[PDB]
Structure 1
Amino acid sequence: MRECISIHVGQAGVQIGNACWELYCLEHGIQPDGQMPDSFNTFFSETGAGKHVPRAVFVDLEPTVIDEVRTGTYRQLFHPEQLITGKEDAANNYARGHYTIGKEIIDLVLDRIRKLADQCTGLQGFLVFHSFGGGTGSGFTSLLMERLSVDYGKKSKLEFSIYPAPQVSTAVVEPYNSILTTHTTLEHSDCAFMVDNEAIYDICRRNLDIERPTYTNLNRLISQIVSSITASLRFDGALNVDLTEFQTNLVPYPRIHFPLATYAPVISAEKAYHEQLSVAEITNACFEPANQMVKCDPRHGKYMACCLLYRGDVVPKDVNAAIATIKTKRSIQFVDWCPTGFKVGINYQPPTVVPGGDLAKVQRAVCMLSNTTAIAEAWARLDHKFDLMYAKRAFVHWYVGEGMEEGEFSEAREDMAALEKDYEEVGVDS
């Protein structure tokens, strides 16, 4: 049992999935062609004799990235009809991915997910990888999440995403897509993790001292985070973190389900020898504003619940010591209505190293997911960008052309402002 289904929507999701599946194949020992020369049941199936098929699905409205997968070294891993492909890209348009182009591919992905979930007896949740800016990763992810909610229901729906950066962004119509997708993410996703590309670049520049990091390094870090998330399902440890109890401990209110991922230690090879990577120091480094994986300052916010996913050579004693030291620190501030705000999971499997990766071999690793109030700042700045572009009605006709109304933008903005008001209300003490 303990099965999970991975969904990768858009280019960002497909490439992050390539990183994640290379990582899992390295972890469980499965060769790229699907043979091992137990614990893979969480992510891999069994087909006849010595075949491990990943429990994933690759959906994108343009063929380029999926055809990279179909021709790359992992072409034997997936069965051909698992990788789903449209004809025309959503073209950075929420409307195209949600109404016009996305409607001719949704039945096929839905029954593919149905058949993929029929093979597993202990399905726990879906991992949906997408981006908040692209037309596909916004619109089609919204459509898929609402169909999965009306179809599957009580199953958890974990969601990994690439939030647009405050400054360094690669799309012009990005805030529109982000607001439109969050208007449906607020209700159709049980726990949506936030990752920003700018923060990955900053982490790679400072810690991993890479002058020129590409998307493959970003996806490698994100894959490490997801592997740390699912290690409890895929391995054993002193304290196990199932997806359901993770969601229960991390989400205090139904609309507040946007925690911040962060991973530690992230270091270069040459920097690793001179560091005594103890549990206390990586636990401290998880709270460091420079090591945050989304460009927002936790100091301006107050934590509400943070889950600690230790893995490697970790004993609960020093975890308790580190948590106490954090509790004593005044810079890290917690809400008064959460006297205990740490969910702890210690695993036995150390984080593996992908060949050719930029991360050093480490005995211990921590993946913190803190549901802080600092994300209200990034959300409010995205709202400011949306308001600027919407006062002049710029780019709106590109959405009204194929299935949108002005009322959709107004509703999305009102819902997002309500979300900000909710975060402000839960921030203030009593």
Structure 2
Amino acid sequence: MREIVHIQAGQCGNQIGAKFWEVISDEHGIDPTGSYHGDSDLQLERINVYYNEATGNKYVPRAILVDLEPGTMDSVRSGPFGQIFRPDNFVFGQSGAGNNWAKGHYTEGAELVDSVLDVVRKESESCDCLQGFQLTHSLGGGTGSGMGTLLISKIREEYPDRIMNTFSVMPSPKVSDTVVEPYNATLSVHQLVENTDETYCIDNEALYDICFRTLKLTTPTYGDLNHLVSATMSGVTTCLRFPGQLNADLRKLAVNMVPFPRLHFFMPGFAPLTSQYRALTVPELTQQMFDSKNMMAACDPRHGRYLTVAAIFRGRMSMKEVDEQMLNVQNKNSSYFVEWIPNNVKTAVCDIPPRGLKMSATFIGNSTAIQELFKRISEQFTAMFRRKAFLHWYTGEGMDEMEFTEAESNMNDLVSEYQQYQD
């Protein structure tokens, strides 16, 4: 009964978090009303990791929905699986955050955080053995970014010995709402560097390119982008939701994936990505799984080196042939795996495939090439900060330029830290 408490904050965090519960609820046989109608006991084997069991055999997601605006959360409550969430777990304000990290972290968010922690405390007090927390949010907005990192800091203060895991959507000018997104992302990244154990870097730039280049979507929407995030989030959590021995919980995952405390930002990958009835062989899954075009972080793996790798194959396939293909990738491209961490590639298999696929593969990599993502944000940050552009939105909320200077230096240090292990 290693329970995980889920939190989704802001527009992006709730829209993506909603699709996540919609996807995994389908894999476990849970309908929109919380009733189980599956046909395999493997669906309920570890259902309590993400679901609570109430009266009447109902399964209630252990999720907390947070936002400073009611807009997106009203859509969730009206969405497909909106009725499955616990009504008390909807914690929202009315002022909004105006895509302003300061508002979410210091002013508006501060006024609402204590009531969110009351819900978290209620959910944790019933857990037999709490693994930790997983947060879904974007770094470019105000609520998910600003209040999201505030919650993480306060959650760590109250549960210091629990694992903190996040799915963090990185902003990109290709899919941009406001020009201050680099500011909000830089401020958040430093919070994540200190207060999370595992962060899946989901780059909206990569999601857009995959929809456009690969999936052949000329005009991708947030719905199209969230389809890739749903499939990826489902893949990376397979080892936590189904019986297994590799990375079966959050702490053991962190022990295998994080050789250094601050280098805990992962590149997720998914295969296949079809734009559809053809059967995909095991060698094909492996090639696509490691292909840059299937990475969700918009970083070139060949530009860096792999510190650790977690692979998850789903479906009825030859586990013998899986071992062969995985060993063939490492043995044929061993120059991209650091030689000072022996056997840094672990492979897990799950019999239950995702909805609509005979089999799939999910890639989780801790590569030094992720620095390209932080350099990108750092360059966009500096382009504006050097002229103090748009700072008044933040100084008006009490912030000082010094705090920006420190966030800039913190991420440039993070980039330097990745660079030393790449050589």
Query: How far did 1:132 drift?
Result: 1.0
- In the alignment, the residues of structure 2 paired with residue 156 and residue 424 of structure 1 have an alpha-carbon distance, to the nearest angstrom, of 26
Could you list the runs of 5+ residues in structure 2 that have no partner in the other structure?
A: 38-43
Aligned residues: 416
* 2:260 maps to amino acid: Y
1:172 to 165, 168, 179: 179
Q: Does the CA contact (< 8 Å) of 2:236 and 2:364 recur in 1?
A: no
2:397 to 393, 402, 411: 402
Query: How far did 1:240 drift?
Result: 5.7
Q: Does the CA contact (< 8 Å) of 1:6 and 1:56 recur in 2?
A: yes
Please name the residue that 2:24 is paired with. 24
How big is each residue's C-alpha offset from its partner over 1:1-20, in whole Å with a ceiling of 9 and x where there is no partner? 12111110110000001101
Could you list the runs of 5+ residues in structure 1 that have no partner in the other structure?
A: 353-360
* 1:29 maps to amino acid: G
- In the alignment, the residues of structure 2 paired with residue 362 and residue 209 of structure 1 have an alpha-carbon distance, to the nearest angstrom, of 19
Q: Does the CA contact (< 8 Å) of 1:53 and 1:79 recur in 2?
A: yes
Matched ranges for 1:2-401 at <5 A: 2-37=2-37, 38-39=44-45, 40-165=47-172, 167-237=174-244, 239=246, 241-269=248-276, 272-273=277-278, 276-330=279-333, 333-352=336-355, 361-401=356-396
SS at structure 2 position matched to 1:49: helix
Distance 1:242 1:315, change over 3 A: farther
* 1:297 maps to amino acid: D
Distance 1:259 1:226, change over 3 A: same
Q: Does the CA contact (< 8 Å) of 2:174 and 2:208 recur in 1?
A: no
Query: How far did 1:239 drift?
Result: 4.8
Distance 1:383 1:238, change over 3 A: closer
SS at structure 2 position matched to 1:29: coil
SS at structure 1 position matched to 2:60: coil
SS at structure 2 position matched to 1:318: helix
Identity %: 42
- In the alignment, the residues of structure 2 paired with residue 82 and residue 343 of structure 1 have an alpha-carbon distance, to the nearest angstrom, of 36
Q: Does the CA contact (< 8 Å) of 1:225 and 1:262 recur in 2?
A: yes
Q: Does the CA contact (< 8 Å) of 1:315 and 1:346 recur in 2?
A: no
* 1:18 maps to amino acid: A
Q: Does the CA contact (< 8 Å) of 2:307 and 2:368 recur in 1?
A: yes
- In the alignment, the residues of structure 2 paired with residue 395 and residue 213 of structure 1 have an alpha-carbon distance, to the nearest angstrom, of 29
How big is each residue's C-alpha offset from its partner over 1:305-360, in whole Å with a ceiling of 9 and x where there is no partner? 111112212443222211221123248612231232202211121112xxxxxxxx
- In the alignment, the residues of structure 1 paired with residue 35 and residue 327 of structure 2 have an alpha-carbon distance, to the nearest angstrom, of 45
SS at structure 1 position matched to 2:220: coil
- What is the alpha-carbon root mean square deviation over aligned residues? 1.7
Q: What's the TM-score, normalizing by structure 1? A: 0.92
Moved segments of 4+, more than 4 Å: 237-240
How big is each residue's C-alpha offset from its partner over 1:246-270, in whole Å with a ceiling of 9 and x where there is no partner? 111111101100010011112142x
